């Protein structure tokens, strides 16, 4: 209980590195009231995920729901994947995020009205600030690029790119029937046959659990250097151009770098689709303090902190919203140059900018981080039409309906084939 | 999803029948040694617990470490709030979770009566030392900190802190007998301001040169051009360069501050280890762990190996003939001068053994500083495995009520808003 202060101290000295005025003082009475409601046809989509680790294996269940002005639409999925630290969580998150993105997009398509909107739980920036990626997953592309070369890679891309189009099709016309789908995720279904086509043909066995790979004749793995020593770069080059240079790689790193690559491309595809929605809004109870304020997009105040300040000084505690004057933009690092040419809306988003507002729906209510792809001005009123609490109703229905024993059945399975060993 | 149940099973069997080939090393048929018989021991079992709650952009954590063995219960405890960063918020928290138990198992050895003193940890030694527990975030701050105040000034900073660490470890021990517990097991929090008042602002955005290595940059790929640019050069020298590479960093008060809290945090982290390794008999029991870099020496996660032996052929243990050394680079040059118990473990290496007691219990992963045979029977003395159960049981999530206890107090001061979000 000694800490009980340190925290408080900590929590205060935090607040008051805000109380301290950087263009905030003024910006507060730059707080607008709420526009007037406008009639809209809306859908809100959240998702839940349940993970279970069994030995060095991870077993997850994703669910994503859209409630609203239409009937209820549902995507499901279940899987097992190699456990990791960075990468295990890393994969599943993307899949979770893609189920929702998919849903919002297909939902928008089933939505009748003059003015239509989709409403997502999260932020838009979260993906393009520090995506569920980390330096690790870009390597996966650059490795892939280098290993199977740019010709076959672009080939790989486009074939998968189109496969996903049909996928979206089957998926859509399934929702239309049963209002739900049990196989919304493509990648881990088509990865094997994609390995066998774009990889297994470029490779040979090597001594133990590895593969010998000729390097296509612009990026090359750092290994090639490391493998070459007594030699001048010249010969490293002449060996390159003469097509003799070759690497000895873990057959499995390669599969996972393929699987990542695909999981990645599919996640990106679904953002590109959902950006197709004209009025798209994100709602968040918390964005965060440090990350974005430092995002180099200059500085943001974290509604939890900022709300705290208002009632303190201006004494307001009034509903309304405060727009952040300068529209945001995803960095260059956060997203490849060569992949973008295949996503025109992500392209467009980068170029156009995101608009965002601290929005307080209710009297003494929480400030929400409201991000949108259209001026807060256009979308905010459409958003207000469905307001119920100090919050919006269909999200309240999307979130409370998005959320077990489903597991120990998946303990009760392998018998009929092999062994009960691991899950105990 | 009655379709994917097959797909799940598959992913499994594959990995199973894949362990069905060569990596046998086959001695499973023999090298399995039934149990060396019990020896007398004085034991201690440490485990830990973490409850984290997020409030807006600031994360709240509660740490409960607990040691139970022949002796009396010992409980170290912490509570803190820190700035949330995507992955690292979790990593500071686990590190301190690690620092609690290393620290705690040590002290239990320190006062333990007997000709035989064994501490029993829940976890793995490897998972500790493969890569820094906070990721190459920590190695970063260390270099920034280093480049910042200079090599020399840093060396003194370091020692200063190391010194401080014992002054603590002694006093903690003081409360550790009187009470048998302590609420400020971590200095890393109660010190830092001084140290920068001392080591930073006595000097003090700033431009910082730094190995491009430090942030975990290169490995990835290289474009053909950097090669052509260097053409007329040997490769060896080219790699010199990419290694040699510096870069500039521009740091506000926050980051400068942060790299510090990270650096010392890391420092107290390894301190609890170097100490803990002093234990003459130290065994790690882990049921399942991270096997990836492990093949990088063959091996298999326990429950994976188990199902194999059974599809081929009892209690008892299967050793591994070659102790695994940890990575030397995983810990920097300038630090290990300061840690022999670590420095030795890289030199020396750690012994791995698979273990099962009863008929139907799965096989755990056993690890030790000093070779299996000696240690194992010592542990086997205390079999249930009892000291474990209690070390674990009690340490677990004594209710989250400890969380929502903090809120209603704040408003007595000024503003409860964060307290709500
Ligand atoms: Mn959500
Ligand atoms: Mn939710
Ligand atoms: Mn534990
Ligand atoms: Mn435990």
From Swiss-Prot, chain A:
The keyword DNA repair applies. InterPro entries: NurA-like, NurA_domain, NurA_nuclease. Its EC number is 3.1.-.-. Mn(2+) binds at residues 46, 121. Its cofactor is Mn(2+). This is DNA double-strand break repair nuclease NurA. Belongs to the NurA family. It comes from Pyrococcus furiosus (strain ATCC 43587 / DSM 3638 / JCM 8422 / Vc1). The keyword Hydrolase applies. Homodimer. Interacts with HerA. Changing residue 100 to A: Lack of endonuclease activity. Weak 5' exonuclease activity, but efficient 3' exo- and 5' endonuclease activities in the presence of HerA. GO terms for biological process: DNA repair. Disulfide bonds: none annotated. Exonuclease activity is stimulated in the presence of HerA. Involved in DNA double-strand break (DSB) repair. Probably acts with HerA to stimulate resection of the 5' strand and produce the long 3' single-strand that is required for RadA loading. Exhibits 5' endonuclease activity and both 5' and 3' exonuclease activities. Keywords: DNA damage, DNA repair, DNA-binding, Endonuclease, Exonuclease, Hydrolase, Manganese, Metal-binding, Nuclease. It holds the Pfam family NurA. GO terms for molecular function: endonuclease activity; exonuclease activity; metal ion binding.
């Amino acid at each position: 209980k000694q800490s009980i202060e340190r925290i408080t101290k900590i929590l205060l000295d935090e607040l008051e590195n805000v109380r301290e005025n950087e263009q905030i003082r003024n910006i507060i009475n730059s707080w607008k009231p709420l526009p007037s409601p406008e009639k809209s046809s809306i859908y809100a989509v959240d998702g839940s995920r349940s993970v279970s680790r069994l030995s060095g294996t991870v077993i997850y269940f994703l669910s994503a729901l859209a409630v609203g002005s239409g009937k209820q639409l549902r995507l499901s999925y279940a899987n097992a994947i190699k456990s990791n630290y960075g990468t295990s969580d890393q994969i599943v998150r993307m899949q979770m995020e893609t189920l929702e993105n998919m849903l919002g997009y297909l939902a928008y398509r089933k939505l009748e009205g003059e003015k239509r909107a989709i409403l997502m739980d999260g932020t838009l920036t979260g993906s393009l600030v520090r995506p569920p990626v980390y330096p690790e997953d870009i390597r996966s592309l650059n490795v892939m690029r280098a290993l199977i070369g740019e010709s076959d890679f672009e080939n790989l891309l486009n074939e998968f790119l189109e496969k996903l189009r049909d996928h979206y099709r089957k998926v859509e016309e399934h929702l239309e029937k049963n209002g739900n789908y049990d196989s919304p995720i493509l990648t881990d279904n088509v990865v094997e046959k994609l390995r066998k086509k774009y990889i297994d043909t470029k490779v040979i066995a090597y001594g133990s659990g590895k593969v010998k790979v000729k390097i296509p004749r612009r990026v090359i793995p750092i290994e090639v250097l490391e493998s070459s020593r007594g030699k001048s770069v010249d010969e490293l080059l002449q060996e390159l151009d003469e097509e003799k240079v070759e690497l000895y790689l873990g057959k499995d790193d390669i599969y996972d770098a393929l699987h990542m690559t695909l999981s990645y491309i599919e996640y990106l595809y679904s953002i590109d689709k959902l950006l197709e929605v004209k009025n798209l809004a994100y709602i968040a109870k918390s964005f965060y303090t440090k990350t974005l304020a430092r995002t180099l997009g200059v500085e943001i105040v974290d509604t939890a902190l900022l709300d705290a300040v208002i009632r303190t000084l201006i004494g307001h505690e009034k509903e309304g919203y405060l727009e952040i004057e300068h529209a945001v933009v995803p960095p260059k690092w956060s997203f490849p140059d060569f992949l973008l040419s295949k996503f025109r809306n992500i392209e467009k988003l980068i170029d156009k900018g995101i608009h965002l507002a601290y929005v307080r729906f209710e009297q003494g209510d929480v400030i929400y981080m409201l991000q949108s792809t259209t001026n807060i001005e256009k979308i905010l009123p459409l958003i207000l039409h469905h307001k119920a609490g100090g919050y919006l109703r269909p999200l309240q229905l999307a979130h409370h309906g998005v959320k077990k024993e489903a597991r120990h059945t998946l303990e009760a399975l392998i018998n009929a084939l092999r062994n009960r060993d691991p899950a105990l």
